[PDB]
Amino acid sequence: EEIIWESLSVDVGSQGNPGIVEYKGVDTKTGEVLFEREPIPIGTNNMGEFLAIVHGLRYLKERNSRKPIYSDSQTAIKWVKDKKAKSTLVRNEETALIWKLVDEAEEWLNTHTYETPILKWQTDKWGEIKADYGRK
RNA sequence: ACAU
DNA sequence: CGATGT
Ligand SMILES: [K+]
Ligand SMILES: [K+]
Ligand SMILES: [K+]
Ligand SMILES: [Mg+2]
Ligand SMILES: [Mg+2]
DSSP states (O other), rough: OOOOOSSSSEEEEEEEEEEEEEEEEEETOOOOOOOOOOOEEEHHHHHHHHHHHHHHHHHHHHHHOOOOOSSHHHHHHHHHHHHHOOOOOSTTTTHHHHHHHHHHHHHHHOOOOOOOOOOOOEEEEEHHTOOOSSSS
């Protein structure tokens, strides 16, 4: 099992969990940063990992790219497959922004199609995903 | 246990 | 050490 180098890798970064959430997508081969989301004041790791995959799907579809997406998040890969982000984060005024984005990402999944393979990055074999924030 |  | 998730 080898890396598919012609791919997009995504990852979340956070300050606290729940805490400030951001995410980015990079070229797996070169590490070039292809997109970065503005920090969201309160969210969870898994909400961010979910949003990162969905943004990747939208990014690749817009560009007519058949590349797969790598994620290190077992949870978010399942949530995308299911089209449902099963987060425990309370809904209040401080979490409204993240929940709006998660709700809108689910809505996009429920109104669009894609063939993009969503692959598990095998951290135990390959080290940290190329989109990692280097904060752990 | 596994993945973050 | 704590949290988010299956
Ligand atoms: K990190
Ligand atoms: K990881
Ligand atoms: K646990
Ligand atoms: Mg990750
Ligand atoms: Mg990471």
